[PDB]
Amino acid sequence: NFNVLFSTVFPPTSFGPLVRKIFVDGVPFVVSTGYHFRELGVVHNQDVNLHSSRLSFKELLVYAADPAMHAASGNLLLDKRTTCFSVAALTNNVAFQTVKPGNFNKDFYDFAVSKGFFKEGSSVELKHFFFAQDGNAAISDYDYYRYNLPTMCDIRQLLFVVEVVDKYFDCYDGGCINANQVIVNNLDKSAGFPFNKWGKARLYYDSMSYEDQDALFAYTKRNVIPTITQMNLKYAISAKNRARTVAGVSICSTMTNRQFHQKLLKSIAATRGATVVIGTSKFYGGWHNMLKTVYSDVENPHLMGWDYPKCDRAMPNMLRIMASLVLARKHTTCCSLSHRFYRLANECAQVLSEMVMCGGSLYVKPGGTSSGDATTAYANSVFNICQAVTANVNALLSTDGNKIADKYVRNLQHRLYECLYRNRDVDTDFVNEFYAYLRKHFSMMILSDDAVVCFNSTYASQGLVASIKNFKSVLYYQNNVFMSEAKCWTETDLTKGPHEFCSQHTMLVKQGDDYVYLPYPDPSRILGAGCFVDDIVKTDGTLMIERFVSLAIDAYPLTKHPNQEYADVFHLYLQYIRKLHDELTGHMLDMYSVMLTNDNTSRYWEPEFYEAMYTPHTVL
Amino acid sequence: KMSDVKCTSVVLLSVLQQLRVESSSKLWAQCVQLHNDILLAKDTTEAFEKMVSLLSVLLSMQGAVDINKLCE
Amino acid sequence: FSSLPSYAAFATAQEAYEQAVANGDSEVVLKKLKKSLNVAKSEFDRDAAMQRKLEKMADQAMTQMYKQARSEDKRAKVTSAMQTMLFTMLRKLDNDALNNIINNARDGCVPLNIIPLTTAAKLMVVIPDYNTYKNTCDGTTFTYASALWEIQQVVDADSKIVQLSEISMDNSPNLAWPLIVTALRA
Amino acid sequence: FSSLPSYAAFATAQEAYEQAVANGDSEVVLKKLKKSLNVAKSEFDRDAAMQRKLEKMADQAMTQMYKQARSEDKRAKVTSAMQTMLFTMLRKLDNDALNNIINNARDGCVPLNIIPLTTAAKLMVVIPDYNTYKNTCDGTTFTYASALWEIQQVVDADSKIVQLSEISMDNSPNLAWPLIVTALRAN
RNA sequence: AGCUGCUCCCUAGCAUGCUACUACCGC
RNA sequence: GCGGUAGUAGCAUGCUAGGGAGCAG
Numbered sequence A: 001n002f003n004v005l006f007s008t009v010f011p012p013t014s015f016g017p018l019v020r021k022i023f024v025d026g027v028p029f030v031v032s033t034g035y036h037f038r039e040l041g042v043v044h045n046q047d048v049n050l051h052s053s054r055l056s057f058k059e060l061l062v063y064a065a066d067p068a069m070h071a072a073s074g075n076l077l078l079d080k081r082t083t084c085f086s087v088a089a090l091t092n093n094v095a096f097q098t099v100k101p102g103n104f105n106k107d108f109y110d111f112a113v114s115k116g117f118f119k120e121g122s123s124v125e126l127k128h129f130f131f132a133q134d135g136n137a138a139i140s141d142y143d144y145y146r147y148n149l150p151t152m153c154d155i156r157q158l159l160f161v162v163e164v165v166d167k168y169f170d171c172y173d174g175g176c177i178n179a180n181q182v183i184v185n186n187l188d189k190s191a192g193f194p195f196n197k198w199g200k201a202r203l204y205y206d207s208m209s210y211e212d213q214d215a216l217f218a219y220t221k222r223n224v225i226p227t228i229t230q231m232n233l234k235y236a237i238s239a240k241n242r243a244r245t246v247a248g249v250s251i252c253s254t255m256t257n258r259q260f261h262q263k264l265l266k267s268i269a270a271t272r273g274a275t276v277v278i279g280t281s282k283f284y285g286g287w288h289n290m291l292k293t294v295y296s297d298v299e300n301p302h303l304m305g306w307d308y309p310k311c312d313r314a315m316p317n318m319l320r321i322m323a324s325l326v327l328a329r330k331h332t333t334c335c336s337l338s339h340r341f342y343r344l345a346n347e348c349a350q351v352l353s354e355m356v357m358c359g360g361s362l363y364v365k366p367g368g369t370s371s372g373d374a375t376t377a378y379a380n381s382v383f384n385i386c387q388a389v390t391a392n393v394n395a396l397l398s399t400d401g402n403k404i405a406d407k408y409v410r411n412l413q414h415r416l417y418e419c420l421y422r423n424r425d426v427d428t429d430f431v432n433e434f435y436a437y438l439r440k441h442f443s444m445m446i447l448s449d450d451a452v453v454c455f456n457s458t459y460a461s462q463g464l465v466a467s468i469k470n471f472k473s474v475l476y477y478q479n480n481v482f483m484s485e486a487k488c489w490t491e492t493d494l495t496k497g498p499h500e501f502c503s504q505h506t507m508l509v510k511q512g513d514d515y516v517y518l519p520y521p522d523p524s525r526i527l528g529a530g531c532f533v534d535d536i537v538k539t540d541g542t543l544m545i546e547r548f549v550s551l552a553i554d555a556y557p558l559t560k561h562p563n564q565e566y567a568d569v570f571h572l573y574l575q576y577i578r579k580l581h582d583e584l585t586g587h588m589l590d591m592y593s594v595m596l597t598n599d600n601t602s603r604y605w606e607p608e609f610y611e612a613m614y615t616p617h618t619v620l
Numbered sequence B: 001k002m003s004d005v006k007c008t009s010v011v012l013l014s015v016l017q018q019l020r021v022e023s024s025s026k027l028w029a030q031c032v033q034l035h036n037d038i039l040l041a042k043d044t045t046e047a048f049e050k051m052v053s054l055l056s057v058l059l060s061m062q063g064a065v066d067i068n069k070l071c072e
Numbered sequence C: 001f002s003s004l005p006s007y008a009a010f011a012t013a014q015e016a017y018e019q020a021v022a023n024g025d026s027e028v029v030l031k032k033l034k035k036s037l038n039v040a041k042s043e044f045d046r047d048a049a050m051q052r053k054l055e056k057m058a059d060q061a062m063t064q065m066y067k068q069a070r071s072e073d074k075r076a077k078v079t080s081a082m083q084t085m086l087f088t089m090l091r092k093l094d095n096d097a098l099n100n101i102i103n104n105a106r107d108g109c110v111p112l113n114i115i116p117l118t119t120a121a122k123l124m125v126v127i128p129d130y131n132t133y134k135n136t137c138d139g140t141t142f143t144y145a146s147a148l149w150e151i152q153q154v155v156d157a158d159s160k161i162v163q164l165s166e167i168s169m170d171n172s173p174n175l176a177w178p179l180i181v182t183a184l185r186a
Numbered sequence D: 001f002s003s004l005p006s007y008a009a010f011a012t013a014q015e016a017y018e019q020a021v022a023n024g025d026s027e028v029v030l031k032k033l034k035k036s037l038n039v040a041k042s043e044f045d046r047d048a049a050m051q052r053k054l055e056k057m058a059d060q061a062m063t064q065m066y067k068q069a070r071s072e073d074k075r076a077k078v079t080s081a082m083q084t085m086l087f088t089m090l091r092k093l094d095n096d097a098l099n100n101i102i103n104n105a106r107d108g109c110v111p112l113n114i115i116p117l118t119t120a121a122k123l124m125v126v127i128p129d130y131n132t133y134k135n136t137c138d139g140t141t142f143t144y145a146s147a148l149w150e151i152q153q154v155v156d157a158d159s160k161i162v163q164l165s166e167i168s169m170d171n172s173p174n175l176a177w178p179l180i181v182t183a184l185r186a187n
Numbered sequence E: 001a002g003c004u005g006c007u008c009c010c011u012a013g014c015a016u017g018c019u020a021c022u023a024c025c026g027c
Numbered sequence F: 001g002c003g004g005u006a007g008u009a010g011c012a013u014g015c016u017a018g019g020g021a022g023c024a025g
C-alpha cells in the first residue's frame, strides 16, 4: 500500500525485468534475473547461474517465454495511437486485423415470416447481430486501459475486510497437487506466445514427463518468470458494437497455476448451498434451489442486483493482490513462506504487469486483471465480496450514533471502529460476530462479478446495512468508476425473482402441484442465434439439427409466459425441427432408395423431451 | 420491413468482404461504419438511404456481372 | 429378418414342438426338443442380432459421409450463392431508390464513388452513350438515386471539358463518350 | 483359432462320435460320445477364447507404445526448433552498445525498457493523423529519446510507399491514415 | 487463437450388475 | 429335484476415454 504511492514518482522506464547478460556454451545470452514491481519493490532470482554448459528442456522453455531477449532484439517503437507505454516492435510492419460479419441463414427466416413473425409493431424483434470492425479494432480496445489509475487503499479498513472475506471462504480446502493429478479438459487450445508457432497445448503437455512439470513448478517457488501475453478478438453475437478482447496466456503460466490452485478451484465448483454459486446448474430444478437459498431467513427482504462497468480494466492492483492472497491463504502446510511469496510474485509478474503483445509489437499492461488466465472467475468473486463488505462497513460506521435505537448495533458500531482503527491484530471473536450479523441481514449470491443481494429492508432504510448508493460511493472512491443507476436494479416483490441474473429473467410458474422459478432468456437472443451464424455449414439445417435441439431446450420456459408472442418462438422451433428431420429423411431417400430403418426421433419434436430438463430428478 | 433491410445489409457486407474490398483501408472503414449504422437504426428511412449509399460501393466495382445476376 | 438360414431350422423345430404339444405323448421325447429347440434360438438370435446392428452401422456411416460430402460441396460455392441470395432479396425489397440505381448500373450509369447523402458533397456518374443521357440528365438537373442533383462539370474520356449545350444527337458521335458528369445534391 | 492342439482333439472326438453314431451300437456309446463332446468342449472353450483375449491385450499394448514413440519424437523436433529460434534471434542483438550499457551498471542488471531505448538501430512511428504528424516527424530528421533520427520509407495502412511531399494539409484526407514512419539512428 | 462452469447428441472400452439359454460337477 | 462353476446372447446402470454443438461470466 505504500509502494503503490511512492512509485508514481520515479520514471516508468526503469520498471519490469532486471535482465543481465549471462554466458552459456561460451555465448552471451540476455535473461531476466529478477523483477521490479510498482507495489512489491525489487525481487531477485535465487537459482540464476552464469556459465551453463547445455540447456535442458525446462531451460529452453523458460528461455523461450521471457520477453527479455525478445524485446532486446527488436526495433524501437513509438506509438501515438495509445497512451500505454509501448516497448518494442519485433516485426517490421504492423498488422491490422479486422472482424468479419456473421453469415445469414435465410431458410429459417423464411420459415419465421411464414408463420407470422417479425410483423411491424411486434414485441419480438431482432436486436443481437454480428457486428463488424475496421482495421485498428484491437488497439482501439486495448487503449481502454487508460481507465486504470494508481490507487491508494485505506489499509486500516482493508485489514478487516480481508478477514471477513477470508471467513467467507473457510468451508473449502486446497493445496498443491502433483503432476499426476491435474485435469485438463479440451487439450487442443493455443499455447500463447511464442509457443503457438509450433503446436497446441497437447504437444507441450506431452513432451514434458511427469517430473519435468514438477521440477518446473518447484523451480518457480524461488524464481520469477516474466511472460508475454497475446490479445485476441472474440467472434460472437452481441447487442452493442464494442469489440471484445481476451488474453491468451503462455503455457508456462497455466502449467504451474493449475498445479497450485486446482484443489481449491475444484473444491469450490463442487459445493452446493454456499455463497459463491459457480458450478451449480439451473437445470433439473437447480435454479429454484439457488433462489430459495438466498431468501434464506431475512426478515423484510428487498432484492438488489448489479454488474460492474468494464470490470477487468477498471480494477485496481491492490484488490487483485488481495484476491490472490485470499486464494493462497490455505497453503499453511504444503508451502513454507518464501515459496508462497515467490509464487505471488510470479502471479503478479504474469497477469498484472506483463508485456502484452497487441498486434505485432510488445506493449506494457498497466494493471487490471487479464481475463484469460487460470483464476479470473474466482478472483472476480473475491473482489466482489470485498466490495460488498466495504460497503457494509462504510454504511455502518458513517451513521449518527445517537439516533440508533437498537442497543445491540450501537455496540457493533463501537467495537467495529475500535477493532478497525484502534487495534492492530485480529479479533476473531468480533470477526465471527460481524460475519454472523452480515449473513443474517445480507444474504448474497455470487458469480464472476454478477451478484444478487437479498437484504433486510427496515435496516437499509436506516443505514444499518448497505444500500445501492453505498456501492456507488465505494466504486467511486476505490474502483474509480461511476455506477450509473441504469445498470443496477432493485426489486421489492420476491414473488418475482431477480429482474436479471446471468442475463436470464425469473418466472414463478406452476410445475406439477407446486410453484417453481424458471430462467427464461431474451427471445431476441434466441431468434438471433437462429438466424445469424458463422461458416457455411450452418446455413443448412440438415447438417446440424442438434443446435436447434439445444436452442429449443434453452427457449422452453417461454412456453409458460403470459405474453403470447413468446411461446410462439418455442412452437416455431419445434415445427422447424420437425421439418428439418422429415426433409432430411426425404433427401436421403431420394439419393439412396431406403430410409432410416429406425430412429426414435419423434421425442425431439414433442414437448415431453424438453419438459424433463426442468423437473427435479436428474437422469445424467 | 426494416428486418429485410438489416438482413440484406448483412448479406451485402458479406459479399463485399469476400470481394476483396478490405484491401483498401478507407473503403473498408466506410463500409463497416455504414453496416453498423444500419444494424443500429431504429427507423426505416435513414436505413434505406444508408442502404443505397452502401450498395453504391458494390455497384461502382466491375467484379459482379450485373446483367447476368438479374436474370429475373 | 426372416430370410436367414437358421430361421428354417427354427421353424422346423417349432413345428415339431407344436405337433408334440398337440399330441402330448411323452415327457422326454418332447424334452429332446427343448435340447434341440431351445438351442434353435441360440444360432438364430445370435446370427439375427449382429446383422441387425450391422444394418444401422451402415446407415449411420452412410449418413455421416453424405453430410461430409454436402459440407464439402457447400463451402466451395459461397461466392455465387451469396450474390444470388442478395439479388433475390433486393428484388423482394421493392424500393424505388434502389431499383433506379440498379437499372442504371445494368445499362451503364455506375458511380465512381460512394453516393453522398448530405445536401452538399460531390458525385460522379459515368455515362457511356447518349440514349442513357436522355433519361437521366435534362437541362441542368440530374436525376439519380431518386434525387435531384445539379450538373456542373461534364467531361469526355480524353480529359477535355465538354460544354453542356454541345450535347445533342447529331454531334454526339464527336465526343469520347464515357462522360464523367460530376454533380451535387439538392 | 484353427491350428491349436485342441482342434485336432475336438476333431478326433467328433469323428469318433459320428462314426459310432452311424454305427449306432449302444446307448452307452451315445453317452460316451456326448460326455466326450461335453469335455472336449472345455478344450475349445479356453484354448480358443482366452487366447482370443491375449491378442486384444497385445494389440492394445503395441498401439500404446507406438503412440508413445510418436510422443517422444515430437519432443525432439520442438526442442530443435526452439533452440534454433533462440540461436538465430540472438545474432541480431549483440551490438557493442549493449556491452557499453551493461558494463557501466553497478551490478550488471539493467532494466529491460531501456535496452531498446539506447541501443535500437531503427525506430518505428505510428501516426493517426496529420496533426500528430506535424509535431512528431516533420521534415527528414527528428529527435526522439534524446537521439537523432533520419526518415526513410514512409508507408500507410495498405503498405504502399508514400513520398514526403504528399503529406500536406489538403492532401491528407486522401491517405490511408495509420501512417507508419520508420527512421534510422543518425550519428 | 483465452480461462472456467453447466447441458444435449454419437461411438468405443472396461468393470459392475441384472435376466434368459447351453454344458460340467457332486449333492 | 437343488446348488455351484464354466459358456453364449440380451438388457440396465455407472465410470472413463474420443468426437460434434449450444448457453452463461
Ligand SMILES: [Zn+2]
Binding pocket: A175, A176, A331, A334, A335
Ligand atoms: Zn503449496
